[PDB]
Amino acid sequence: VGINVKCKHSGQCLKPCKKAGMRFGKCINGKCDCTPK
């Protein structure tokens, strides 16, 4: 999916991910990638 966020913590990506409307937000190469349903 990919969101306009930076992976500071594997779990922090959840916070902007709920704004994305996705399920969870995992840490990707420096960035935050969300998991859809």
In this structure, what are the phi and psi dihedrals at residue 13, rounded to the nearest 5 degrees?
Answer: -65, -15
Tokens at 2, concatenated:
């990919």
Strand partners, 5: none
- Residue ranges covered by each domain of the chain: 3-35
What was the elucidation method? NMR
CA distance 28 to 7: 7
Tokens at 10, concatenated:
């594997």
Using left for φ > 0, alpha for ψ between -120 and 50, and beta otherwise, residue 33 falls in beta
| 28 CB-near residues (< 8 Å, 6+ apart) | 2, 7
Residue 11 CB neighbour total at 10 angstroms: 12
